[PDB]
Design a binder for this molecule. Structure first.
Ligand SMILES: CCCCCCCCCCCCC/C=C/[C@H](O)[C@H](N)CO
Ligand SMILES: CCCCCCCCCCCCC/C=C/[C@H](O)[C@H](N)CO
Lengths: 245, 297, 48, 97, 245, 245, 297, 49
């Protein structure tokens, strides 16, 4: 009644038998842009099923020596399917998301992952270590795509802010003795009603082990983490040639 | 008109935001009710599932035998007005005679309130904040001495010409707003509106403003939002000649009519730069104090 | 941008070249905000 | 409607009236380019000649739709068809039609 | 229905078969001076048909190397007919105008003229070129009469103001492939209800080629521009001897 | 009232001052697929403005020695814009079209073009000339794209069928002394409600000079023909990876 | 539900076909009405614009002074039933004893009615035609002699096994339809339905059936529609041994309950192949007869 | 050539949506444009010169 879930959107369907629940972000479900909030006058295209569907990015391995990974939205879908063509062919973009993270393990495995949504996850750097260099992150760290990027210092989230207060955003846990899926539903969060998908990323998705993975020699040592995500209430406006960046 | 059934039975264009929660009034703290002993099965309010990502809905009425407490403790001082409507240092401008800082008698200050840690860490608790403000300019000599000098505080919005000198043509303030004050007067105090082309300022911007390739040259642009570049503050000694007093202008901003969205983790590391969440990676300090062992104090 | 769709076709006796005058304005939904001083015209000092 | 100085190439006094009209001539029929300019009124370019581009100097933020009207000043016998494309942002300068 | 027009006022009549429309200036038709706006107490003379009629001044030639011409009102009619006698014999003057400019060419001719009404068209000078001399225009440049005067620098209209923003006043175009007449109806525009016709000129009339005239060798190379104008709702007050200037 | 037309669909707009009329094909306007005619059960995507808009293919030159050109639909838009991505990403396709052909010339030019829509324009070949070889057309002749293909024998339309009976399909004429545009609106024509856009072409578009172009030495000798076309009531169904052929 | 106005005021999902024309009854030819002389301006019915792509709406009442003619000429013989419900040769199968054609006593015929020019040019007037049919098999010797022989006409749909011989196992017709006849009997005559997976057959298919690269090898596939491959006709001499009579089976098809769509130009060039609109490019013949000059007859 | 400006809107050139505008024209008035103090004069009162 609460540990089982089927998520159907589009031509896609996820099953889970070992769920917790669904987190609906900031108590707002995704919606479409009202005529009061809108400023642009062009008619937006609303492709219902060709972009609002579950996309599967890649698979990270939870090892003992893991530190964490982050993915930036909507950068993860700007080279993938029909979404990443409407987003390149258009200038404006608006959508929510349903993120769904998968990690399966046995009943003889232990560990926990914090799966959180951090809006406007701006990436800082070590500043040379001494704090004198005003270094900056390259493009393959702020918009790393579907491959994601490995956190160097996950205590401060590579932004000088503590991981411990990160439950103030959306989150779930994947505790392997309780659940193997983490489902968060995110609305469109920005000061503007639409924005560019290639220049601006609305939020980040952190997957950090707070408790480390452990097992005894003989069990399956490959414990994959798979990110699977669906746009929701997508909208595109301002059509011109396809530019990638 | 709509004919096919998938289009009639469609949720496309549902602009109304469906909210789960509703804001109710809480002028006081919640009162405690009387509780007795519980010795049954099935009803177990102490056990939670924190993996859900929610917080515990357990109260003290269900964990101990409690009395009635009629609370009259007000939640009025935790509002965002009461927390932010408190003037703090956001800027400091030095106008010396000899040196390098500003040896000509004018000074331009790009408006950013992220140069002082005590007001910055208060605003970076949120990612979006919309407010009207009240700026106050406390002018004085290095020693704190009040002297008989006239100044001109010109607001230079973006696009308008910045003054290249004290004798400049931009100082005629025909359309830009200005304030003339003597240092012998009370500090100038003006109210400012919400002046963003957006619906709120934003202290964090995960993105670039410009299209194109992003090489190591134009990596300064990471994080820069032009919706927060509200322009320039300019100050001069009103006169054709050189002043005789050194000067300092200190700027104090008080927010009013505040709205905020999307709380964040609070900064635990020392800031280093303006509009840059960089940190010292070698000298990473823990968020609090430490112990010798976990079984002691 | 302005592109030739077909061509500029002209008969014999008429001139092979013409000119186009562009005229720009704003629409009924246009507004401006936050009055300031202008930047793209400046004055060399010593007026009169 | 005020005149937009698209052909803002000449600078000498002898040829400053040439800035108010730009040419259109006979081509090879390959979808060739005549002129290109930005749709930015406050930006230093053709719109500086307009009353919009000068009253926008006195304001910091603008909103709303614009309007560009092109008039053909050729012969009655001359014919032609032209494509006038507005390319929204992100789109670089199109290399072809 | 809109390309044909007959303008009848007085003992005069203009036909046109290739018109655009009539421009009514600042949405005000000419009128007579009300008793509230009036201050002078003498009874004004209102000669209906002897001064409100079409007068034809002269003929300028549109060559290739043309720059433009201006005419000042009412200076163009201060030596012409019954108007230019009532205006000399009286001290005060009030009138509107209907200006009508004529330029005929073939269908194998191309070119455009901006025909505009500039109120209080004060004439500046080159100031020695360097801007140090505070030179001034002579009387045969500020009040040049029916002969008009040839613009030296029509980009700035010999006043330091751009031709490009001149469509903010009244105007029409004479595009030779569309029209050959330009009809503007101007009311009395002044801070005062009456004024002198010899000392003060209310507005100027600019005729500038934006697009240059071109034709192939064999066509009629003389393309004349003819100014034809009618007072409207004329009024004169304060009678004394006839003075010309 | 009938020679002027503005065609607005999407973010696109065509003007014409020298039109004939609009041909609505087989008296049927384009429509969407009804639930009775439908058999496939997946929800189709209906992107209103991002694919239903005017696309401009290329420009053919009408010379004296011309024979004709054909273009195959929807092959002309399978590498172009958002239409040619939804069509590659999906398996099924349904749309009407508005074709619009442009040819401008002077009043001293003469010639006529037959602009016709031939459904299921199957391409035959000369069979070796003797009729013994059972030759076949290559792929760059049956699906030639936006470049189109030049007819070898336009009398038989390279299919053994006479050009003279081709007015039984949709058509207009471009008679240079009467019109310069030809506008045909075509519904979806197939035995099936949907079909593949890459494998099957619904109809062809023939542009043939019946009367040859002529002009005297001195006139503009480059007389271009430009094809400009808009999908209408587009629909896509069956989503998988993007395949081009 | 739909909230935004662009979605409420949308014509998306309008499945109803908007038709301009309407079919009215025309059982007879149109009658001629009385006309008199016309000597006015403006009304000029002889002048047309053929560039519109329409046909002239000019009648003879407007071009000459006409009388009243009450027509009773029926349009009943131009219908598609009356034009196509006429049996014609669509197939011919030879069953000889010695030779190469079919020397074993069985013959399979892939059903296509495009091997005889006189019925093919009638159907290729349209691109889509839907109909039920009536096939008739006239069996005889080469000389036309009727002989005492039994045959079996098996319909082999697509997917079903074709017989590799006369002694084959497919001939048991447990599920495929069959007809046994003696040559001494009247010709077998069976009615067939519309058996396409589509809504109509199609004589022209502008496309390929398969995906993939299209090189010179798989160019035979151009034009092939599997919706028209209705299967195979098979015939044998019912017997375990060799027959003694040569045989020919001629097939005659009559359409009934006809519907047709999208008329085309009619074939003017000689056909060459089956389901291939190829032509002889060197010997292209004009559509009709020629003259010595245009001013003569 | 009429001398008027174009009465063409974006509803007739593209497929548009509904936009309920709440952008005020109050800052373009002549009060708001001119009720802003600016330098119109400067007088010098020296001792020698
Ligand atoms: C005499 C007139 C002086 C008036 C000057 C008032 C300036 C108004 C600006 C107030 C708004 C400040 C908002 C600043 C935001 C942050 O600094 C940016 N996000 C930069 O990081
Ligand atoms: C004893 C039973 C025999 C019955 C055999 C009847 C066969 C039914 C087929 C009738 C339909 C023929 C339609 C043919 C279409 C064209 O040949 C194809 N498009 C091939 O070009």
């Amino acid at each position: 009644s609460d540990r089982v879930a089927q998520l159907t959107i589009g031509n896609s369907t996820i099953t889970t038998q070992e769920a917790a629940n669904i987190i609906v972000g900031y108590g707002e479900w995704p919606s479409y842009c009202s005529d009061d909030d809108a400023t642009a006058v062009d008619k937006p295209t609303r492709p219902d099923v060709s972009v609002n569907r579950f996309y599967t990015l890649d698979t990270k391995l939870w090892e003992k020596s893991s530190k964490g990974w982050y993915w930036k939205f909507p950068d993860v879908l700007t080279e993938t399917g029909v979404f990443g063509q409407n987003a390149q062919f258009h200038y404006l973009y608006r959508s929510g998301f349903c993120i769904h993270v998968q990690c399966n393990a046995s009943k003889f495995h232990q560990g926990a992952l914090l799966v959180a949504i951090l809006p406007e996850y701006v990436i800082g750097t070590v500043a040379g270590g001494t704090g004198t260099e005003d270094s900056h992150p390259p493009y393959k760290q702020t918009q790393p795509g579907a491959d994601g990027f490995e956190l160097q210092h996950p205590y401060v989230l590579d932004a000088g802010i503590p991981i411990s207060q990160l439950t103030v955003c959306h989150h779930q846990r994947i505790n392997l003795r309780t659940n193997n899926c983490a489902t968060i539903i995110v609305p469109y969060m920005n000061t503007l009603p639409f924005d560019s998908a290639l220049n601006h990323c609305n939020f980040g998705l952190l997957v950090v082990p707070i408790s480390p993975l452990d097992f005894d020699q003989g069990a399956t040592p490959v414990i994959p983490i798979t990110i699977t995500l669906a746009p929701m209430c997508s909208e595109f406006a301002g059509l011109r040639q396809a530019v990638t960046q | 008109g709509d004919r096919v059934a998938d289009v009639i039975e469609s949720s496309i264009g549902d602009s109304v935001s469906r909210a789960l929660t509703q804001a109710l009034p809480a002028p006081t703290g919640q009162n405690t009710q009387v509780s007795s002993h519980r010795l049954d099965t099935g009803e177990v309010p102490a056990l939670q599932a924190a993996e859900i990502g929610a917080s515990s809905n357990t109260s003290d009425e269900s964990m101990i035998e409690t009395r009635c407490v009629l609370n009259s403790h007000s939640t009025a001082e935790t509002t965002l007005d009461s927390f932010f409507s408190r003037a703090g240092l956001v800027g400091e401008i030095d106008l010396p005679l000899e040196g390098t800082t500003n040896p000509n008698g004018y000074a331009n200050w790009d408006i950013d309130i992220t140069g002082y840690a005590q007001m910055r860490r208060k605003v970076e608790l949120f990612t979006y904040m919309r407010f009207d403000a009240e700026f106050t300019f406390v002018a004085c000599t290095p020693t704190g001495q009040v002297v008989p000098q006239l100044l001109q505080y010109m607001f230079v919005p973006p696009g308008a010409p910045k003054p290249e000198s004290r004798e400049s043509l931009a100082w005629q303030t025909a359309t830009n707003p200005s304030v003339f004050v003597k240092l012998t007067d009370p500090p100038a105090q003006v109210s400012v509106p919400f002046m963003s082309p957006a619906s709120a300022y934003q202290w964090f911007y995960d993105g670039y403003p410009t299209f194109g390739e992003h090489k190591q040259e134009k990596d300064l642009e990471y994080g820069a939002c032009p919706n927060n570049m509200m322009g320039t503050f300019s100050v001069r000694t009103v006169g054709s000649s050189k002043s005789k007093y050194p000067l300092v202008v200190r700027i104090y901003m008080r927010m009013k009519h505040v709205r905020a969205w999307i709380p964040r983790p609070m900064r635990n590391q020392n800031y280093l730069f303006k509009a840059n969440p960089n940190y010292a990676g070698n000298s990473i300090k823990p968020t609090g104090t430490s112990r010798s062992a976990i079984t002691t104090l | 941008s302005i592109w030739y769709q077909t061509n500029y076709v002209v008969p014999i006796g008429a001139p092979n070249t013409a000119y186009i005058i562009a005229l720009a304005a704003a629409q009924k939904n246009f507004t401006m905000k936050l009055c300031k001083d202008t930047s793209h015209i400046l004055q060399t000092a010593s007026i009169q | 409607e005020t005149i937009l100085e698209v052909n803002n190439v000449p600078t000498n006094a002898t040829s400053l009236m040439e800035r108010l009209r730009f040419p259109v001539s006979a081509q090879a029929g390959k979808g060739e380019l005549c002129a290109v300019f930005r749709a930015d009124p406050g930006r230093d370019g053709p719109w500086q000649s307009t009353m919009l581009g000068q009253l926008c100097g006195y304001y910091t933020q603008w909103s709303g739709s614009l309007e560009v009207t092109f008039m053909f000043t050729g012969s009655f016998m001359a014919t032609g068809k032209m494509l006038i494309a507005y390319t929204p942002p992100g789109g670089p300068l199109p290399k072809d039609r």
